[PDB]
Amino acid sequence: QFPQLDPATLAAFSAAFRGELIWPSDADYDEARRIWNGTIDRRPALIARCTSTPDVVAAVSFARKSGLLVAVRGGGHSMAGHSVCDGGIVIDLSLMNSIKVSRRLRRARAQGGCLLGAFDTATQAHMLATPAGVVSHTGLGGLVLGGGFGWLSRKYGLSIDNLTSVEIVTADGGVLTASDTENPDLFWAVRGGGGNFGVVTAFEFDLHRVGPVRFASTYYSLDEGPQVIRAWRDHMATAPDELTWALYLRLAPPLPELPADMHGKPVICAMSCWIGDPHEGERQLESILHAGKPHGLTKATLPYRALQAYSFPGAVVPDRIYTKSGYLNELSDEATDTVLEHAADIASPFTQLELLYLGGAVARVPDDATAYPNRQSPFVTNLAAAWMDPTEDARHTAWAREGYRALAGHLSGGYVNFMNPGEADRTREAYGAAKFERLQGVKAKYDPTNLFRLNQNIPPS
């Protein structure tokens, strides 16, 4: 926390760095060191709030020369707590939030500290968009480096499936461009390989015209759980790419569109949208609303930016979280009953068991085309415990582990962006042998000293 640093190397850093520094003595230190996973409480020796690529260069070099453990933070959403370290440096990108958008080229160049909401605002000024996650205050940086999925994915792929190049500052402090024609080995590995390979300071995306989106959300009783999940599973097997439909098993939020009788009870929250013409969307969405008896139905036609900003409306932002996730190739009747059993035990108002269906454009990309594993597994499940009181940490986490272990025979792989702080040992199984090996090769070449290790880490061969 207060390590001795060489004064000369510190002075050099300072003259070269135009951003803001935050030291452990400063009034804003405790707030700046907080990340969205409030169970992570770590005290860096320094927070370096970078404002340009040269800033990031100066910070990487200063960390390398100084031997400080490097944490890189984009939006701070790491479910594993990777964006803050004890005793090291946080290379904080959050003030690097610029997006340039060319309407004529349908192209966006976004800085590596951008929030999704900032990105979506900029592109939707021209009615353009590309795929990213569903929660507006997520960081673009960590999400895209992991793959990145959300509302537009079945139609347009992962965020990485629309990435055309990056600017990246590597461990030696060099700046590189990686694309299909420049450093293509590196460009393959950052598309799903995390922060393993250097600090991405700029992402370039291809964009799509995305007009108003017919959206519906509704709640079903858990009593109809088997019928609704089976309807969903079967429907999605053959659904148009334009339909996206997610199920979130949760306590029903105390909202006026729901009967007060249902408040605080476990329910299925079904969220769905049609990426395409809204009169077609009305017809498609209507055909799936009656999976069970619907309650608290909201239907609306939203600009895409509002659909992005919609998840997940509540009075409280949860302080503490714990996730256990994996992919499924098939969702059997026995797996569904497991899901529903564990759902009924849910305790916190903020906890959910989510069941996502990917496939569509995501699956049509050849497996070896990026470092993202598991394109062929269309289902994702996430036991996302979330709560407030730290005295309850044991009970919440036990809930998520029990559900995972009960589902374990059905699960395969794992999305790097959904790993928790105790899942370092999941990296090889999540990527697979062929992928984990080619990633190690690229690690050996670009970060042979493993300067970047506060991520779902790939050690160099």
Residues that bind its own copies (CB under 8 A): 18, 28, 31, 51-52, 94-100, 102-104, 115-118, 120-122, 124-127, 136-137, 211-212, 214, 255-257, 278-279, 281-282, 298-303, 305-306, 308-310, 312-317
Q: Which residue shows structure tokens 């309407």?
A: 103
**Residue 77 annotated as part of some ligand binding site:** yes
CA distance 343 to 353: 6
Instruction: Between 179 and 221, name the residue whose CB sits nearer to ligand FAD.
Output: 179
Instruction: Between 131 and 292, name the residue whose CB sits nearer to ligand FAD.
Output: 131
Residues lying near ligand FAD in the complex (CB under 6 A): 35-36, 72-79, 82-83, 93, 112, 133-135, 138-139, 141-143, 145-146, 148-150, 194-195, 199-200, 417, 454-455
392 contact partners, CB below 8 Å, separation of at least 6? 348
Instruction: Between 142 and 414, name the residue whose CB sits nearer to ligand FAD.
Output: 142
Q: Give the pair of three-digit tokens for residue 440.
A: 């190690």
394 contact partners, CB below 8 Å, separation of at least 6? none
CB 444 within 8 A of CB 358: no
Residue 266 interacts, among ligand FAD, its own copies, none and using kind-specific CB cut-offs from 5 to 8 Å, with: none
**Residue 83 annotated as part of some ligand binding site:** yes
**Residue 374 annotated as part of some ligand binding site:** no
Residue 353 interacts, among its own copies, ligand FAD, none and using kind-specific CB cut-offs from 5 to 8 Å, with: none
**Residue 415 annotated as part of some ligand binding site:** yes
From residue 356, alpha-carbon distances to 171, 377, 396 in Å are 36, 11, 22
Residue 289 C-beta-side C-alpha neighbours within 13 Å: 18
* Helix (H) or strand (E) segment spanning residue 30: helix 29-32
**Residue 326 annotated as part of some ligand binding site:** no
Q: Which residue shows structure tokens 């070099």?
A: 61
CB 441 within 8 A of CB 193: no
Of the candidates 93, 89, 64, 88, the one whose C-alpha atom is nearest the C-alpha of residue 77 is: 93
Q: What residue type is assigned to position 205 of the chain?
A: F
Q: What residue type is assigned to position 282 of the chain?
A: E
**Residue 203 annotated as part of some ligand binding site:** no
DSSP state of 252: P
- The answer to whether the bond into 62 is cis (omega within 30° of 0) is no
176 contact partners, CB below 8 Å, separation of at least 6? 167, 168, 170, 182, 183, 186, 198
Instruction: Between 282 and 392, name the residue whose CB sits nearer to its own copies.
Output: 282
Residue 97 interacts, among ligand FAD, its own copies, none and using kind-specific CB cut-offs from 5 to 8 Å, with: its own copies
| Nearest approach, Cβ of residue 203 and ligand FAD (Å) | 8
| Nearest approach, Cβ of residue 28 and its own copies (Å) | 7
**Residue 454 annotated as part of some ligand binding site:** yes
Residue 112 interacts, among its own copies, ligand FAD, none and using kind-specific CB cut-offs from 5 to 8 Å, with: ligand FAD
| Nearest approach, Cβ of residue 172 and its own copies (Å) | 23
Residue 102 interacts, among ligand FAD, its own copies, none and using kind-specific CB cut-offs from 5 to 8 Å, with: its own copies
CB 274 within 8 A of CB 285: yes
Q: What residue type is assigned to position 459 of the chain?
A: P
Instruction: Between 77 and 324, name the residue whose CB sits nearer to its own copies.
Output: 77
Instruction: Between 76 and 292, name the residue whose CB sits nearer to ligand FAD.
Output: 76
Residue 452, SS3? coil
Residue 88 interacts, among its own copies, ligand FAD, none and using kind-specific CB cut-offs from 5 to 8 Å, with: none
Residue 333 interacts, among ligand FAD, its own copies, none and using kind-specific CB cut-offs from 5 to 8 Å, with: none
458 contact partners, CB below 8 Å, separation of at least 6? 193, 194, 196, 427, 431, 436, 439, 440, 443
Residue 146 interacts, among its own copies, ligand FAD, none and using kind-specific CB cut-offs from 5 to 8 Å, with: ligand FAD
The number of residues making up the chain comes to 461
Q: Give the pair of three-digit tokens for residue 248.
A: 């979130």
Instruction: Between 53 and 83, name the residue whose CB sits nearer to ligand FAD.
Output: 83
Q: Give the pair of three-digit tokens for residue 225.
A: 């759980």
| Nearest approach, Cβ of residue 237 and ligand FAD (Å) | 22
The binding site for FAD comprises 72, 74-78, 83, 112, 134, 139, 142-143, 149, 200, 415, 417, 454
The binding site comprises 72, 74-78, 83, 112, 134, 139, 142-143, 149, 200, 415, 417, 454
